[PDB]
């Protein structure tokens, strides 16, 4: 699809089962999600954004569903006010921003 | 122009006389720069990210030349490890993301 930007662009995801909404984010390197389940081993992380520190949990090759696009990357899971997909998932869909 | 997400979505700004770089953020509703000079009244407003707050200075109807392109909006100027150009400046170039 193409998007405005008008308002927040926002689509559906599904990762390990479990249907949410995020936020396309060209401003982020990596996904981070808050509101979400992954079994398996992790890595700690830290971040770093308007506000500073977020410690993350880092799931590597989850499988994930964006806009009905199957794709597998990392996710950074921990406190977001927002869940953001980021360009390390983006670049996946082939995203293009344009002006 | 087109561009891909495989790098940072970086372009030049020129904002009161001053060269700058900044990020093509779609997941900013506002713009928000640190290392700039505005002149005039202001209004002191939060934003919050990951991380937390920051303590920023909302500057209205400031002209700001993005990529080439002349518009005018609200700059936020404030703590941000990274100048990024929101949506309230990228939909008056028209942007839009591809996939
Ligand atoms: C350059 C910075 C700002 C990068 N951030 C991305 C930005 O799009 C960020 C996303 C966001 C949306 C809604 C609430 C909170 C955050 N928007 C943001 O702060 O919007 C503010 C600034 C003015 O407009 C409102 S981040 O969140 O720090 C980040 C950092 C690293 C990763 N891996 C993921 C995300």
Redesign the interface.
Known sequence: ??????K??IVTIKIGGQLREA???????DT?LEDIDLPGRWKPKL????????KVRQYEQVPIEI?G?KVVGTVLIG????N?IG?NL??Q???????
Chains 1, 2 share one sequence.
């Open positions: 699809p193409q998007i405005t930007l008008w927040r662009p936020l396309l984010d060209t401003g982020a390197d981070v971040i770093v954004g308007i506000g500073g520190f977020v806009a696009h406190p977001t006010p927002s953001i360009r983006m670049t869909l082939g995203a293009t921003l344009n002006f």
